[PDB]
Design a protein around this ligand. Structure first.
Ligand SMILES: CC(C)CN(C[C@@H](O)[C@H](Cc1ccccc1)NC(=O)O[C@H]1CO[C@H]2OCC[C@H]21)S(=O)(=O)c1ccc(N)cc1
Ligand SMILES: [Cl-]
Ligand SMILES: [Cl-]
Ligand code: NA
Lengths: 99, 99
């Protein structure tokens, strides 16, 4: 796909057996999803942005289908106002910025 | 250019005659720069990010060069942790997301 940026670049993802919508975010180092359960081990992390930091759970080796493209990587889970696909998984689907 | 996402997509910007670095951020509606002086009047705006909201100064019709492309548009100034180029100016320089 080529995605213009006139509106937010929202896509459908599948994670943990659940379909969700998420923002493709080149400004995010990491992927962060709103509170949900995921299997396996986790460790606590703080992640910071505009407005300050939030505490999240870091799960490693989680598979996510992103607009029909599979990726595996770390997923943070916590009180983010929107689900965000960050660079750690955007690389894996071959996403690039073009101008 | 075609910019991969293995590293942060940082580019040089020029605003008020000064070179700065900024992040190309598809997850940002709005361009926001760290504190600096800009001409004209400003308007109030609240910006909500991962960690809560911040107050910023909204300047309209500001001339800004981004990675060698000319844009003229709205720039917010406030305590962002990093200079960010959001979709309002990414559209002006013709940027798309591709995968
Ligand atoms: C601020 C950037 C350096 C980092 N952010 C990614 C960014 O794209 C967020 C992503 C985002 C989007 C919506 C709400 C919260 C965060 N956008 C954002 O805060 O933009 C604000 C300015 O324009 C506005 O439009 C969106 C909210 C405003 S972040 O959400 O804090 C974040 C930080 C670290 C990770 N790993 C993942 C995400
Ligand atoms: Cl990862
Ligand atoms: Cl104010
Ligand atoms: Na795991």
């Amino acid at each position: 796909p080529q995605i213009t940026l006139w509106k937010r670049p929202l896509v459908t993802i599948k994670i943990g057996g659940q379909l969700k919508e998420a923002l493709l975010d080149t400004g995010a180092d990491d992927t962060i999803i709103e509170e949900m359960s995921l299997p396996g081990r986790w460790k606590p992390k703080m992640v910071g942005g505009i407005g300050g930091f939030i505490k999240v759970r870091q799960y490693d080796q989680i598979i996510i289908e992103i607009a029909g493209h599979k990726a595996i990587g770390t997923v943070l889970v916590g009180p983010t106002p929107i689900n965000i696909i960050g660079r750690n998984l955007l690389t894996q689907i071959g996403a690039t910025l073009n101008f």
